[PDB]
């Protein structure tokens, strides 16, 4: 065959906890166009893989990753194919490069039959999250063909400025997350809405301060913004995009329900075994991993797992495993991919550290125990963002993981790509 969406009845996997190394990563970073050069950071990475195709994005800067000079943004798509080694790999088919790379932010790719549609924000004020009041909401869609054609005009690459956004009570909406899904001919991108603190409806009584002696009932609401006195709060959700409508292009915002509400954060909606799952980064006090089956897409309500083993590093005020309401904006994005719904086994990369972004560990886990895991790097390895998508290769469950790591071999912060087969047997 080739590489397919994880759906139907795939090959069995060890379902029992073992400490022996039965996962062996394969490095496939040479397949993406990360051309190293001394003194250039490569950040804002994006990875999506749907139906045997994939989307990837990065921005390479000269010097620092924060204050470096934006050199080049690239958005690309291709096929995920067998190397020959029965090991899945990325092969680029189509890459777009905007003329001004410092203008494009928070891209998000959703696959639909012939293309990857990549929704991005356009800003002349920097990151909208850190310059919310000055950002004039402006959105773009880069549509890229996964199989380019010879003499096709704009079939290969079409840019679209968005001009009609329905956003309810929110002032501004923006894509916020690596990848989205399709339902029929409708696309859903992970997104965030900016709502003024003054119009935010929230009863402080809902803040669970009960077994937290040093937590004030005001903390949840204060933590709905990137600082306690921020003009806006942020609310996760989806940007819906119905392709059947045709004509010109309407994006509608769907807010997330307030069950286990945390601050708007990079999120992912994906499809697994024939129904949608949602991951949301933990960017505040609620640090245990937030993911689960989507119950309704519109309105958006997630059946969050009660997961007690996976978390993320933080800073002094909301470090890993913190559970008490604090006023903080900190954490990392480390998603997971459900690979077995009946047992709720997921696979993902977590940073095995409390207040430091390091030690990427690929792990297969249920709600209350990690079944088996393996490091992806040495034990002082700087690493922050991880995107994990899983699929079938001749019916074997594989997972590809992007990790933004500090590479000591080049002395450079950049993304790396791993392939990991989920093993069937539990011994050696």
């Amino acid at each position, epitope marked *: 065959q080739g590489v397919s969406d994880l759906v139907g009845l795939p090959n069995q996997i060890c379902l029992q906890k073992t400490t022996s190394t039965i996962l062996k990563p394969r490095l496939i970073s040479y397949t993406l166009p990360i051309n190293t050069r001394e003194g250039v950071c490569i950040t804002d990475p994006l990875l999506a893989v749907d139906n045997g195709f994939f989307a990837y994005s990065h921005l390479e800067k000269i*010097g620092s*990753c924060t204050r470096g000079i934006a050199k080049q943004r690239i958005i690309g798509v291709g096929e995920v194919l067998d190397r020959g080694d029965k090991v899945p790999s990325m092969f680029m088919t189509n890459v777009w490069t905007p003329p001004n790379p410092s203008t494009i932010h928070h891209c998000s790719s959703t696959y639909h039959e012939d293309f990857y549609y990549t929704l991005c924000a356009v800003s002349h004020v920097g990151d909208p*999250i850190l310059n919310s009041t000055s950002w004039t909401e402006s959105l773009s869609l880069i549509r890229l063909a996964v199989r380019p054609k010879s003499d096709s005009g704009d079939y290969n690459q079409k840019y679209i400025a968005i001009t009609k956004v329905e956003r309810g009570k929110y002032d501004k909406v923006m894509p916020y997350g690596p990848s989205g899904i399709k339902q029929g001919d409708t696309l859903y991108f992970p997104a965030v809405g900016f709502l003024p603190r003054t119009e935010f409806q929230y009863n402080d009584s809902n803040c669970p301060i009960i077994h937290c002696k040093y937590s004030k009932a005001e903390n949840c609401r204060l933590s709905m913004g990137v600082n306690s006195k921020s003009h806006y709060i942020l609310r996760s959700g989806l940007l819906k995009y119905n392709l059947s409508l045709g004509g010109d292009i309407i994006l509608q915002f769907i807010e997330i329900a307030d069950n286990r509400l945390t601050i708007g954060s990079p999120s992912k909606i994906y499809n697994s075994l024939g129904q949608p799952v949602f991951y949301q980064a933990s960017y505040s006090w609620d640090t245990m991993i937030k993911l689960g089956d989507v119950d309704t897409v519109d309105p958006l309500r997630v059946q969050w797992r009660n997961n007690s083993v996976i978390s993320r590093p933080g800073q002094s005020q909301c470090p890993r495993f913190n559970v008490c309401p604090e006023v903080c904006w900190e954490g990392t994005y480390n998603d997971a991919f459900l690979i077995d719904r009946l047992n709720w086994v997921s696979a993902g990369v977590y940073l095995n550290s409390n207040q430091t972004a390091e030690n990427p560990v690929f792990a297969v886990f249920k709600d209350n125990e990690i079944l088996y895991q393996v490091p992806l790097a040495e034990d*002082d390895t700087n*690493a922050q963002k991880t995107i994990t998508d899983c699929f079938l290769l001749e019916n074997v469950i594989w997972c590809i993981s992007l990790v933004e790591i500090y590479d000591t071999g080049d002395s450079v912060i950049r993304p790396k790509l791993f392939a990991v087969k989920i093993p069937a047997q539990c011994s050696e």
Partner: antibody
Amino acid sequence: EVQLVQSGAEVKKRGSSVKVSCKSSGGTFSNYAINWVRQAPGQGLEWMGGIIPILGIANYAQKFQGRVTITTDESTSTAYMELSSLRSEDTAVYYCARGWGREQLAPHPSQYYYYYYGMDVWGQGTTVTVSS
Amino acid sequence: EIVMTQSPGTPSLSPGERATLSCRASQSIRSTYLAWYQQKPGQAPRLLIYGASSRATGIPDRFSGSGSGTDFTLTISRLEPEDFAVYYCQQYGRSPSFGQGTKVEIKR
């Protein structure tokens, strides 16, 4: 081999400022870090701050935050340390020293950290005496 | 905001003896962020050990470093005359800081 050659001795009045320099002389700063380390007479070494010139960024020990600025002229391959509001406590030998320096992903949505590693190339030091 | 404290204050040893110096951290640190320096009077310091055990380039075999967490140790297997100097430990990373120093002195 590189050599860090520092500026000459200084005698500064109570309350003034001083700007020691350190020139790289035999290789540039390329992606290393320049640290500044002072030593009062009879006393021990004390890290003041550092700069990583290939990035923009400079970092300081809390004790010196506000009083110390560290800069570079990357073209002439030179680093500077400016200490203001000087007092008798600042009478010391001020060393300039090179090592690895590195930007680090932080467990934060926007912040980054900066690590200064061990210092293997040292300048000869600059004595500065604060007296009236 | 990490403090390094050094011991002994001032040991007296003889050429050919073995010196072992100790450095204690006010809080746990990864081994990879510990360094040892040497300083003779009227001279700059020179790096001896880094990453808590790796000898700097050009440094004789008799120098070796060890320890972890809170406690680290520098060992001169057999002293030469030029080894009688001051030794500083240092933790580095986001805000490096030095120990207060240990002077190794000739015994008679």
